[PDB]
Design a protein around this ligand. Structure first.
Ligand SMILES: CC(=O)N[C@H]1[C@H]([C@H](O)[C@H](O)CO)O[C@@](O[C@H](CO)[C@@H](O)[C@@H]2O[C@@](O)(C(=O)O)C[C@H](O)[C@H]2NC(C)=O)(C(=O)O)C[C@@H]1O
Ligand SMILES: CC(=O)N[C@H]1[C@H]([C@H](O)[C@H](O)CO)O[C@@](O[C@H](CO)[C@@H](O)[C@@H]2O[C@@](O)(C(=O)O)C[C@H](O)[C@H]2NC(C)=O)(C(=O)O)C[C@@H]1O
Ligand SMILES: CC(=O)N[C@H]1[C@H]([C@H](O)[C@H](O)CO)O[C@@](O[C@H](CO)[C@@H](O)[C@@H]2O[C@@](O)(C(=O)O)C[C@H](O)[C@H]2NC(C)=O)(C(=O)O)C[C@@H]1O
Ligand SMILES: [K+]
Ligand SMILES: [K+]
Ligand SMILES: [K+]
Ligand SMILES: [K+]
Ligand SMILES: [K+]
Ligand SMILES: [K+]
Ligand SMILES: [K+]
Ligand SMILES: [K+]
Ligand SMILES: [K+]
Ligand SMILES: [K+]
Lengths: 257, 257, 258, 257, 258
């Protein structure tokens, strides 16, 4: 399709505002936003994580006003919601030293968001190809030792919530022409969360040709991961803790051939 | 309201200058700027922090010269006051190693400020929905497991000083059109404070259309949190320590219809 | 080479898109992307690392559409480390950070490097310890002397073979490489956290200060990479380097030369 | 009223000097160091020895006599002098581990400098209002518990060298209109010094109206603090270590009414 | 000197390209690039470091094409630390970070410094401890007093000899050096990770605020450096400074002066 001119007039712009909840595993009715405590396999070959222990990608498909014109996503404001919850250092955590406050949430984090006019395209890569991923997840199939670095058979769409585990999928850099994505992995058991909030920062979604994601079938795709670190229980057991992400996207009508 | 032209001339600008004190809990008559020492609950479900153990958001409502014209906030200079107090490593503390100086204030910090033409709008998010917040604080009511990630029932206004606990409220990104807010949470038990001071830095408060916060009823709302970290006593017990925040805001008269 | 005008027209541009797999040592059939566990010699004179223990530079020579004097000129690069989220696997027979805790994540010394050129990357040999014996099957600084620990100009090579040039004994030669653009960061320390950014919105321009990108001799583009992310610690305490693949997308245009 | 700048080869001058640190100087061999740091048992009993307290440095520099013209400070180059001294890890130190080199200078730092046309204006803030500041220092008088966050009674001028302790005074952000100040407090017991040197970096001292500090009575005021960290002796006792600061200021003649 | 116009034409420009080796002490014939292991004095007054334990400033005086009034003006610099990947040798008589682990990498206090000038770098002496006795064969602050621990204006010198001026007791004199451009960073702490970037795409402009670079008196260019990367800990726990070489490429042009 050739991309032609932008429509103007009051009717030619719309905005989407929503939040995506994290999908950390939710091991019971009290533990939304947390994973199951992490257990370590006894051998490398026997790695077999339970579903409730695996954070997954979040995705939302947002219907847009029914419209060839297509909605074009132009700008994004985004923010992690509830950053201050990490100041709760009194809820049966593990004291940092005798008589001290509880160790706060810290350690490995992944903060990721994307906006596209279609599902985020994923490529599978595994730390350990002999990992058995659990029933109820969607994972790289027929994994081989090459899957530990790059196996081009592992292609997928982020088209279901609570399904695609964070650890075995990444955005496919060979695709995603119609999505804009951004992510940071910060590894290490002691890394401090650094979480900024403001309502004054905007990301522009236009490519080098001045064209944003074009929304196929009048749907906008939002995806996110916000694993903030791990919470350490009094006992020493550790659980991933996630937070929700706010999205505000401005869109305009674009004519295409 | 339609936003029209800025008024000019001698009478057309004013400035507000003030400071907001921190509200860290103030557990006795000698401990202004500190919280009660932190105790950890025996079970996750039994989390029940004392009011004096909970830092709260600070807020001041500043009356402006009586004026349709509205005062429009254009610029901000702001600074944390008393940064050098953290060099007192010679009292009541715990030696870092044998014969050493006292461990300084360090660990989790939250530094936050906002300027608006009405009260800061808040969204409640809790680390643990079964936490019992104490009498005398304003907290998310009817919390459910969903409140651990996002429950849209928890809406409030920062309309009372020394009342809204930092750990269960954040600025609501879905509102606050008439406020500009900025915050950073830095977690981890050993993170060092890094506090910059200068009288040469200005933040511009105008939005993408050149319009700043417009002060309803001729009132300016300033809000802050500056939890710098925790002080460690000889025994190992820890108390939050906060500092005051300076604000200087320049405003101009704006006609609206 | 007198560089003259760029060609225009639909036929005058092309793109290369590919990935380079990491070459960390691959000690057995199950450990692609990992090195052999690291052992330490008791003296400098007895340093004799096995090949499987040594990360090597990755390189690919990519044939371009045949020309002919026109040369393909590399103008822009998008690049990304592939599989960053694998580092969230803290459940696979690692070493618990404390009693009942999750496994220690991959961390420690990293080297992230990539280059795009119109010919093989030119290397200079430098060694931590001149008495290290590099193993059969690797290409290494020959006739090393104690001066090789700081600079010995005899140690010149081309990155012309995959999984052969060990990362620790070669660097890009700053005295050469006029027809390549290279970028690298070494972050040392046993506890340093990986910080890995991904996005499809970032482009690096490959043009020099005169507006000229690498010119592809014999219609070949050379891509090189190292992405040692840190070390994985096993339950036993033994440590292995872990690497990831790197994606490259390069835009090229036809340039006339004299 | 600020009017035009004078031109001509005679319309400019410069000041070049250095300010020595004032760390306490506990004996004839320990210039640049404080006395070893001890820890009082309680806030109430806190009574630091004069030789244990770093103080602000200040110099009042007479300028060429003018009279209405004033000297206007336009640019600053500044540098910490002697950064490589911190590579002496072989002198009376505490080995980091068996057979190791000495632990280097590290921990809490405060780096601060200012250039003004009159004395730096100070605001008193104290970590602990019951601290008894020693004879020979100038400190907040009639401190109350409110002095721990903000007590507007504690106003002073930095008008004497070796006298104003760093820990109980900061620049007063409510004043200092005729000064430019810059500082960073980096806390934590183990934080590493990061000290940059170059002769290629210039700070412009002009405000948003294009006006620099105007030198009242033809005096320029320079102030500094450069507490680099603490030096740990073999026994583990710790002392503040400071370094001198270079200033080069360019000034021009400005007419005023 | 009044500075007048730049000369143009093919003959009006020249380049200097070289490397400066680190001078860390070189305690024996196998340890070029390292210092002697660091020992600690038991008092301030007894501090008496041996020469081979003291890193020194590196300097090269580079003769330029003879001109005579014209002077060579240094305009741009490209510079790089050479051999950054040697720090990935964590298998050579180091100290395991934990049982069965790899060796602790080079880390801790670093100083990275370079300068380009039209005359010798001007130095100011400052000492950690004025009672330190600096060794025979070094050039050090003479007649040191307690004031030498903060600032003693007697301690003025020129960086005019290689392997001679210890890093720890000398810095560039900010009160002079008008005809030099210098840049340095000291990163302290015993555990700080080295962070070393390499690229052939970065240039530093040496022109001052008037558009004038360093002017080469007597047609000599002065290059100086220090690259103490950190300390290497051997198996016994003893620690030695480790340094690396620095590459310089400087472009110069002819400038008329009066
Ligand atoms: C935030 C929170 O709810 N923390 C609690 C955790 C948490 O619910 C689970 O770890 C989620 O996976 O549970 C803690 O107690 C558990 C459960 O009862 C432990 O005592 C473990 O119980 C076992 O029965 C089990 O889970 O199978 C046996 C196991 O050996 C126990 N683990 C340990 C380390 O003792 C917890 O500490 O993990 C309580 C915590 O407040
Ligand atoms: C700066 C300061 O005032 N430090 C003192 C603190 C401080 O006043 C409180 O922690 C503020 O909440 O108190 C220290 O003593 C306390 C009581 O004064 C402890 O002994 C605790 O007393 C209890 O009664 C209590 O609940 O507060 C019982 C508790 O078991 C005690 N805790 C400990 C760790 O012993 C203190 O160390 O916290 C003295 C300190 O100088
Ligand atoms: C990711 C992975 O495969 N980890 C396993 C490693 C790994 O395969 C090798 O270290 C790669 O070089 O092996 C672990 O077990 C090995 C045997 O496979 C050890 O028991 C070591 O075996 C030796 O035979 C050997 O030289 O490799 C002898 C050596 O003494 C043993 N080392 C130790 C520290 O016990 C491993 O822990 O290294 C298992 C791990 O899951
Ligand atoms: K398995
Ligand atoms: K593509
Ligand atoms: K409760
Ligand atoms: K809104
Ligand atoms: K050998
Ligand atoms: K060259
Ligand atoms: K007292
Ligand atoms: K004021
Ligand atoms: K001596
Ligand atoms: K000078």
């Amino acid at each position: 399709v050739e991309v032609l001119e932008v429509k103007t007039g009051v009717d030619s712009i719309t905005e989407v505002e929503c939040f995506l909840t994290p999908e950390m595993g939710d091991p019971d009715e009290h533990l939304r936003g947390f994973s199951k405590s992490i257990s370590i396999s006894d051998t490398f070959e026997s790695d077999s994580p339970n579903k409730d222990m695996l954070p997954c990608y979040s995705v939302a498909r947002i219907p847009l006003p029914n419209l060839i014109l297509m909605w074009e996503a132009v700008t994004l404001k985004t923010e992690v919601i509830g950053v201050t919850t990490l100041m709760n250092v009194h809820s049966n955590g593990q004291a940092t030293h005798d008589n001290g406050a509880a160790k706060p949430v810290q350690g490995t984090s992944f903060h990721f968001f994307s906006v596209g006019g279609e599902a985020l395209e994923l490529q599978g890569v595994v730390f350990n190809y002999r990992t058995t991923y659990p029933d109820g997840t969607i994972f790289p199939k027929n994994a081989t030792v090459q899957s530990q670095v790059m196996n081009t058979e592992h292609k997928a769409y982020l088209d279901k919530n609570k399904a695609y585990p964070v650890e075995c999928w990444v955005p496919d850099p060979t695709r995603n022409e119609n999505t804009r994505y951004f992510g940071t992995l910060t590894g290490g058991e002691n890394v401090p969360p650094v979480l900024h909030i403001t309502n004054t920062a905007t990301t522009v979604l236009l490519d080098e040709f001045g064209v944003g994601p074009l929304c196929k079938g009048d749907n906008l795709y939002l995806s996110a991961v916000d694993v903030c670190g791990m919470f350490t229980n009094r006992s020493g057991s550790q659980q991933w803790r996630g937070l929700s992400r706010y999205f505000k996207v401005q869109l305009r009508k674009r004519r295409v051939k």
